Nucleic acid binder design. Structure first.
Ligand SMILES: Nc1nc2c(ncn2[C@@H]2O[C@H](COP(=O)(O)OP(=O)(O)OP(=O)(O)O)[C@@H](O)[C@H]2O)c(=O)[nH]1
Ligand SMILES: [Mg+2]
Ligand SMILES: [Mg+2]
Ligand SMILES: [Mg+2]
Ligand SMILES: [Mg+2]
Ligand SMILES: [Mg+2]
Ligand SMILES: [Mg+2]
Ligand SMILES: [Mg+2]
Ligand SMILES: [Mg+2]
Ligand SMILES: [Mg+2]
Ligand SMILES: [Mg+2]
Ligand SMILES: [Mg+2]
Ligand SMILES: [Mg+2]
Ligand SMILES: [Mg+2]
Ligand SMILES: [Mg+2]
Ligand SMILES: [Mg+2]
Ligand SMILES: [Mg+2]
Ligand SMILES: [Mg+2]
Ligand SMILES: [Mg+2]
Ligand SMILES: [Mg+2]
Ligand SMILES: [Mg+2]
Ligand SMILES: [Mg+2]
Ligand SMILES: [Mg+2]
Ligand SMILES: [Mg+2]
Ligand SMILES: [Mg+2]
Ligand SMILES: [Mg+2]
Ligand SMILES: [Mg+2]
Ligand SMILES: [Mg+2]
Ligand SMILES: [Mg+2]
Ligand SMILES: [Mg+2]
Ligand SMILES: [Mg+2]
Ligand SMILES: [Mg+2]
Ligand SMILES: [Mg+2]
Ligand SMILES: [Mg+2]
Ligand SMILES: [Mg+2]
Ligand SMILES: [Mg+2]
Ligand SMILES: [Mg+2]
Ligand SMILES: [Mg+2]
Ligand SMILES: [Mg+2]
Ligand SMILES: [Mg+2]
Ligand SMILES: [Mg+2]
Lengths: 117, 95, 148, 243, 19, 166, 190, 97
RNA sequence: UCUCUUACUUUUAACCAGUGAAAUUGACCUGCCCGUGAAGAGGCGGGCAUAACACAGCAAGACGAGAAGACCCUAUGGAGCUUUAAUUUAUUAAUGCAAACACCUGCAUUAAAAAUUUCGGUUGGGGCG
RNA sequence: ACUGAACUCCUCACACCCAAUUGGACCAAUCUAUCACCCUAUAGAAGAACUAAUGUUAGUAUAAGUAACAUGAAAACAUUCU
RNA sequence: GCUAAACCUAGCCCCAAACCCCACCUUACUACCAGACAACCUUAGCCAAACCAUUUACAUAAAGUAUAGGCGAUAGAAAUUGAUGGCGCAAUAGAUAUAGUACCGCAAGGGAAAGAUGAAAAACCAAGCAUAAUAUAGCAAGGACUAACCCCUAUACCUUCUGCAUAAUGAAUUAACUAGAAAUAACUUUGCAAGGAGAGCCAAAGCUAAGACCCCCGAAACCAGACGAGCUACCUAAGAACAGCUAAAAGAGCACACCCGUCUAUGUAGCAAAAUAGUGGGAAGAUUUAUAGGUAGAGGCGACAAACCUACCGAGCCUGGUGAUAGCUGGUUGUCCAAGAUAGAAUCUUAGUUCAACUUUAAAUUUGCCCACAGAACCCUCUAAAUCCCCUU
């Protein structure tokens, strides 16, 4: 009789409560006998770096100069990464400079994005 | 009748009045006597002569017909050869 | 508003209703009094009295041919082509006292009116005008503004 | 409040705005034009004026078309502008009697037709009116090509028209291969209906089909900005080198 | 015929009011 | 809502002349929004009306009604404030000149009846007001004696005039 | 009035939101009979006879009557000594103080309606002087009207405006009954 | 108690603002301007009642005829219902008949 | 059960304390008898009675509360049902004729099923006559 | 003989006692145009006037402080007992 | 002196102008598996015709004309012509809106209420009562009186009616809201005038403009489209329950649980919008019952009780047509004056209406009333009060 309350797994009979989740991403599948097979590759692996020797504390000294915000753009990235090589080889096949015709074949495909975060 | 038409908002005319009565511009309404074509074999010649006559109407009947017909039917009509042309105005009428 | 009944409730029967008795305007036999009324030609009367009055007041100039346009311009007659008017008819009224010599063109003319016009040395001709031409001649300026 | 435009102009405004704007001009004009269909279920008046016997006066007379309901099955066949008449009748043909809903349906026949241009046999549900029209046109191909959309009244008919017109425009060698003389004879016979292939492609397409066709025509995977910036930088360096 | 007029409940907000 | 009773304690009279009778002190106190019917409170107010502070407290201490305790607390507060702030020399030298109960702001509730029907309850609240006047309580109005009653009758007889004449 | 268009409207019981169902049955409840909660009797219900839509009060007096009214206004001003004829509205300066002082010296009213022949040719000095004033209003000859003449205590006219008004108002006398709207060409009407 | 206990804030009306000062100007535009413009052309308001007057039924009919196609759906439905009701009332109810 | 009712316990009840509705309500300073009258008076006429208020019972009256009487009549007000009431066969089922070469379509006829609508007035209340 | 009307006279003044219906003279308040400026005037308008519809909403009464409702006992408020 | 009173702006109305990260169709807001299934088809009815059955509306001018029409209620062209805010609302108003929220309903769906200080809060008035219960007698007042009462006079109001104090209706009371819309034709006042009017229209003093007359609430109903078989009727799938004793494979008996509801009492605004206590029928079956699904209103279902289909089924409920209609009932709000109660006829009509009669208003004119003789029938032997007519007055 309650329509304004959110539909959650805590409401409904046993089947409803078991079937509905809470947003947690799946980790594996179910086989005969309701046995859960967990796939390791489906478990997110936290790639935590080595923080030893790292000099960047969470906060920044207040005695730091203020600089204008310059959001990075495709043109700026091209100028700062590809333009020097293009100029050098023009003075002296874009794959050599860095262009990749297709995202297929890459572990990290930019579009459609196939990596987390 | 229809006092305000749904399409024009005007007053309408009851066409039965137009089909049955004649309005003289003076304000008189002329009519034919009822039953002037019915059972003439059993009616005496005097009765037939009375029925074959064109007849005026009461003041109240004239007012009713004026209400049921619009102003277009009360205009002055200069027909070519109107048999009722001479009857459209009153003469030597006191009050 | 009275007391109860239909009159106070504002629901009294239509006009012409006689309480169920066959109404007066329906028990009278239909007769063709107004059959073809919208197709009967109408001619505005123009008495010789009116014409002489106009000529005397100078609203109609007898030194030039007089026709429907001149009469309308002088305001001696009002033509309503939309109301089935087919023009102007000369009328014998005022024939005895009519003295102007004029060349007038009308649509209808009585024998006595023609006689008076001709006796006074004038000329009268009866000219037909179908409704479109009649409207144009009565009101030429609007027609000229139509651009046709 | 009040809409800026009358509601009945909203379809035209949508045509003017959006991908419908990018649709080709000839197709848009074909959609806009609304030539009245040939009378089928009513007898048209002989002239624009008639002397009414009641008062013996000349009165204007207009041909008011009878609304026709075309069931979806008709679009799969060739009904010669014929469809269901959904109306009412007076029992015993007297207005003082009861009024009853009446549906008049055409007599549909399954017939096989051969298209010379398409060189194919089509089995089509047809009406005797359509058969008479085909006989008058001297062939299914002639009937399809001559009949406009508003008289053909069949999506299948318009698709057949598009196919025939496309083959005529392309002079397709696929029409009777290994028989160039016969192919040329057919094309010459139906020469007068030839139109540019660009128009023939859009002939007989519904609004949604035209929208989909235009979307498929103008869908392009975005060009990587790498190429654009490389071209711009190369042009700039060329200008610097020249000057 | 049996005549029954169902009871009509007044809105709850009228009696739920608090200072 | 109105709160004039509280303000009544803020009136400051001009200094009295030496040849003027000493003005008895007046202390207005009240309690607002008592969970009690004003009709029931009226009986307690009438009971203690016109009595000395000590006698009113004595009666209220042994009356069983709930409002008795509330009125006793109000009277004790009135006595304390009269001594502290209104320059009343003696605690016992005060009498209840005015004591009334006023309607408070009530809440409406629903009472369920037998057949889907209902009634509108009222969570009744009442105010309570007291004026304490310094000095002994005024003597009760003695009943009029036969002598005074006959005197009034004779005065009525003497007041007679010849009505409706010159 | 003729310009008036009252934009007052009220929702009738048919236009008030809701009010479709019967609040309760005819009989057995012991309450008054009702057919909807939006009838005029109910709180929040419709308005039985309220203002309905934008209503126009437009009506035209005969142009002869309006011209006669203008004439009567002019005669009233002249007879009551509120009419002042001028050769021209040219001022020595555009200062509104000069105009106000001149009116006060000449004993004109607190409100002055100055009239010139045409809007375009009105002198710049008087334009500047009257643009900054509230009770001194400058209008073209075509803009003269009874309401403004009555509102303003004194009426100032120029000689060309006098001739213009005389011609326009006298034409209504001795004009025929129209054959068609005077905007259309006539033999002698500009 | 339906009477306010305090005087309402004073209402100051500028009798000589521009609107009041120039009110009525060009009302004689026709007679004083060779009848180039009719005074009704000075009326600013709804398109369907510019230089026109009528009862409620006539006004509703004119509104539907002139701007009915541009009206909102529910507003047009309300106008149709109002026209229906006004027709019934004016043609079937009243003291006089 | 009753002749024929009595005794007791509990609940209810009354009193004290807390909390606290409902229908109802023109205003009421709200008596009895007879007569009157819109044809059964607290209110009118003639008499009689008459300090003031509480509390507990009672049910003779306030034509008591309750449901705009379900009985009866009326309404050119409804609806349900039945027909051998009037009007129809739009719809199905058959046939016959066309159309096409059994089906489909059109036109008729017959049934089945239904659909719409009505059920006058006067009347010593209505009905019957 | 007298008493006895709103009949009549007397002094003064007079439009100032019939339902439905009809004619007329005024008019409260509101807004607008001009006035006015401790509450107004001349006009134009209109959601323009409520002792009554088992009227609607809200407040508070009457019935009524009435009908109804609630907490087994003692105690150290541990606990025990019925 | 308490309840309380007030308040001004939150907003809204009418016009003009202008065109407007992730999750989610599975049980929505659910990361992640073989589909195939796809939309189009006349509105009807209320209502009017006083029933109802054909029928009944959904710029200007021509014109409410031609035409249509149980030729009647009513419907109704075309040719042709030319085309910048508020004498709005201001918290019961204005949008329903502080919000489609709270709340109500299974669902469609229905649908509210209200807030007020100040520049800064970092500063006297409705009802109801109380003050202050009451004194013989009486529509609660009036005449009065020295005096409140005592004296004398006085049968609340509204509606309805022949007639109401009526023991006929409504009303506890205060506040707020709550109900006469308009054409024809006339009348009054202007303007112009044989012409008037800002095309059209009218005109034998007319034309143009203005002023001034036409209510509110209420049905059972009808139709269209949605929503409903979590209750109940029946059914489908796959489940569960039935102690003990007698008998023996039983629509068997006694009897629990369980189902039902025979009779009594209580209750009747109740504990309950159908209950409680006792009593009683069945209780291994045509039983009872949990879960999910199905049949939907021109219908379903029915061991027919016109049963049941979400508490009110002779046919559900919601929304819409819809402000349905009602000759019927009720209501219809400032002051004052004046005139004002009249025969009948017709009518599916006698609860109404139209015409007469009466009545009202304005205008023109001259006779109006009362009434002297004379006069108005025989049938019929006699045979009334009178009447009609009617100069004078
Ligand atoms: N009648 C009316 N005029 C409006 C309305 N809204 C705006 N106006 C007028 O629009 C004009 C300009 O309005 P402003 O707000 O001053 O300017 P703006 O924003 O450029 O105006 P718009 O282009 O109309 O949006 C003024 O004359 C306003 O009175 C409206 O709703 N009705
Ligand atoms: Mg009444
Ligand atoms: Mg009556
Ligand atoms: Mg319950
Ligand atoms: Mg209470
Ligand atoms: Mg509605
Ligand atoms: Mg209703
Ligand atoms: Mg509202
Ligand atoms: Mg108690
Ligand atoms: Mg008696
Ligand atoms: Mg008692
Ligand atoms: Mg009794
Ligand atoms: Mg009773
Ligand atoms: Mg009854
Ligand atoms: Mg009936
Ligand atoms: Mg006397
Ligand atoms: Mg005034
Ligand atoms: Mg009002
Ligand atoms: Mg009131
Ligand atoms: Mg009331
Ligand atoms: Mg109480
Ligand atoms: Mg009691
Ligand atoms: Mg008790
Ligand atoms: Mg009917
Ligand atoms: Mg009726
Ligand atoms: Mg046209
Ligand atoms: Mg509101
Ligand atoms: Mg008070
Ligand atoms: Mg009584
Ligand atoms: Mg009574
Ligand atoms: Mg009664
Ligand atoms: Mg009562
Ligand atoms: Mg089920
Ligand atoms: Mg067993
Ligand atoms: Mg058994
Ligand atoms: Mg049976
Ligand atoms: Mg039965
Ligand atoms: Mg139900
Ligand atoms: Mg009604
Ligand atoms: Mg009188
Ligand atoms: Mg009859």
């Amino acid at each position: 009789a309650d329509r304004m309350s959110k539909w959650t797994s805590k409401r409904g009979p046993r089947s409803f409560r078991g079937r509905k989740g809470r947003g947690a991403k799946g980790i594996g599948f179910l086989t005969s006998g309701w046995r859960f097979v967990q796939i390791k590759e489906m478990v997110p692996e936290f790639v935590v770096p080595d923080l030893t020797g790292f000099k960047l504390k969470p906060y920044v000294s207040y005695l730091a100069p203020e600089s204008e915000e310059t959001p990075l753009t495709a043109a700026q990235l091209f100028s700062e990464a590809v333009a020097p090589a293009i100029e050098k080889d023009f003075k002296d096949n874009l794959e050599k400079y860095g262009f990749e015709p297709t995202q297929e074949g890459k572990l990290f495909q930019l579009y459609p994005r196939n990596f987390l975060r | 009748l229809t006092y305000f038409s749904a399409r024009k908002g005007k007053r309408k005319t009851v066409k039965a009045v137009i089909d049955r009565f004649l309005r003289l511009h003076c304000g008189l309404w002329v009519r034919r006597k009822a039953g002037y074509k019915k059972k003439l074999w059993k009616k005496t010649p005097a009765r037939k002569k009375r029925l074959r006559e064109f007849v005026f109407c009461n003041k109240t009947q004239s007012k009713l017909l004026d209400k049921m017909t619009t102003s277009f039917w009360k205009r002055r009509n200069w027909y070519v050869d109107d048999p009722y042309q001479k009857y459209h105005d009153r003469t030597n009428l006191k009050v | 508003r009275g007391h109860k009944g239909e009159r106070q409730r504002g629901t009294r029967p239509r006009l012409g209703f006689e309480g169920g008795q066959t109404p007066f305007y329906i028990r009278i036999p239909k007769y063709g009094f107004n059959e073809g009324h919208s197709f009967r030609r109408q001619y505005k009367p123009l008495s010789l009295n009116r014409l002489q009055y106009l000529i005397d007041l100078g609203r109609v100039d007898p030194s030039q041919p007089i026709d429907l346009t001149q009469l309308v311009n002088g305001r001696g007659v009002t033509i309503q082509p939309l109301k089935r008017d087919y023009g102007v008819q000369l009328v014998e009224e005022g024939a005895d006292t009519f003295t102007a010599k004029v060349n007038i063109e009308v649509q209808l003319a009585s024998e006595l009116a023609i006689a008076a016009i001709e006796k006074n040395g004038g000329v009268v001709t009866t000219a037909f005008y179908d409704p479109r031409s009649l409207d144009i001649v009565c009101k030429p300026v609007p027609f000229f503004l139509r651009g046709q | 409040p009040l809409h800026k435009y009358p509601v009945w102009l909203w379809k035209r405004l949508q045509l003017r705005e959006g991908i419908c704007s990018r649709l080709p001009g000839h197709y848009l004009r074909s959609l806009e034009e609304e030539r009245t269909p040939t009378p089928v279920h009513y007898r048209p008046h002989g002239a624009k004026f008639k002397i009414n016997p009641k008062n013996g006066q000349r009165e204007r007379v207009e041909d008011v078309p009878i609304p026709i309901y075309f069931p979806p099955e008709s679009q799969r066949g060739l009904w010669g502008g014929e469809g269901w008449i959904l109306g009412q009748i007076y029992a015993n043909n007297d207005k003082l009697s009861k009024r009853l809903k009446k549906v008049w349906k055409p007599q549909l026949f399954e017939r096989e037709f051969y298209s010379e241009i398409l060189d194919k046999k089509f089995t089509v549900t047809v009406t005797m009116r359509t058969l008479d029209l085909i006989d008058e046109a001297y062939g299914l191909d002639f009937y399809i090509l001559k009949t406009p959309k508003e008289d053909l009244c069949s999506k299948f008919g318009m698709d057949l028209k598009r196919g025939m017109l496309l083959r005529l425009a392309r002079q397709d060698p696929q029409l009777h291969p290994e028989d160039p003389e016969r192919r040329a004879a057919i094309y010459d016979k139906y020469k007068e209906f030839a139109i540019p292939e660009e128009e023939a492609e859009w002939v007989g397409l519904t609004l949604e089909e035209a929208i989909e066709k235009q979307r498929l025509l103008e869908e392009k995977d975005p060009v990587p900005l790498f190429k654009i910036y490389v071209a711009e930088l190369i042009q700039q360096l060329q200008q610097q080198a020249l000057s | 015929k049996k005549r029954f007029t169902p009871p009509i409940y007044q809105p709850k907000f009228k009696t739920e009011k608090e200072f | 809502i109105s709160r004039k009773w509280e303000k009544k304690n803020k009136i400051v009279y001009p200094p009295q002349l030496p040849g003027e009778p000493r003005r008895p002190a007046e202390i207005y106190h009240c309690r607002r929004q008592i969970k009690y019917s004003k009709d029931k409170m009226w009986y307690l107010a009438k009971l203690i009306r016109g009595m000395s502070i000590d006698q009113a407290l004595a009666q209220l201490e042994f009356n069983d009604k709930k409002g008795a305790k509330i009125i006793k607390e109000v009277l004790l507060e009135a006595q304390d404030m009269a001594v502290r702030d209104h320059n009343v020399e003696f605690r016992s030298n005060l009498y209840i000149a005015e004591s009334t109960s006023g309607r408070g702001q009530c809440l409406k509730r629903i009472r369920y009846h037998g057949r889907g029907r209902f009634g509108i309850m009222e969570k009744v609240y009442c105010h309570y007001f007291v004026k304490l006047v310094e000095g002994p309580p005024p003597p009760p109005e003695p009943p009029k004696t036969a002598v005074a009653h006959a005197k009034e009758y004779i005065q009525q007889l003497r007041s007679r005039t010849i009505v409706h004449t010159l | 009035n003729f310009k008036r268009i009252s934009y007052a409207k009220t929702k009738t019981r048919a236009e008030v939101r809701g009010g479709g169902r019967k609040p309760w049955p005819q009989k057995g409840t012991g309450r008054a009979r009702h057919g909807s909660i939006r009838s005029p009797l109910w709180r929040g219900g419709g308005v039985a006879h309220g203002p309905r839509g934008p209503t126009s009060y437009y009506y035209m007096l005969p142009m002869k009557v309006r011209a006669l009214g203008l004439k009567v206004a002019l005669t009233v001003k002249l007879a009551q000594d509120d009419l002042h004829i001028m050769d021209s509205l040219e001022l020595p300066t555009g200062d509104p103080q000069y105009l106000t002082e001149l009116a006060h010296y000449r004993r004109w009213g607190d409100s002055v309606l100055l009239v010139d022949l045409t809007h375009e040719e009105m002198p710049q000095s008087i334009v500047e002087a009257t643009s900054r004033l509230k009770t001194f209003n400058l209008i073209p000859a075509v803009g003269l009207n009874v309401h403004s003449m009555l509102k303003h205590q004194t009426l100032v006219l120029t000689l060309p405006t006098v001739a213009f008004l005389e011609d326009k108002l006298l034409w209504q006398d001795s004009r025929y009954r129209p054959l068609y709207p005077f905007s259309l060409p006539y033999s002698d009407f500009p | 108690i339906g009477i306010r206990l305090t005087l309402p804030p004073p209402k100051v009306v500028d009798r000589w603002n521009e609107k009041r000062a120039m009110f009525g100007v060009y009302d004689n535009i026709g007679i004083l301007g060779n009848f180039e413009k009719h005074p009704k052309e000075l009326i600013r308001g709804p398109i369907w009642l510019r230089g026109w007057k009528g009862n409620e039924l006539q006004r509703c009919i004119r509104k539907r005829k002139m701007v009915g196609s541009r009206m909102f759906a529910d507003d047009l439905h309300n106008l149709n219902k109002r026209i229906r009701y006004l027709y019934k009332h004016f043609n079937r109810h009243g003291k006089f008949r």
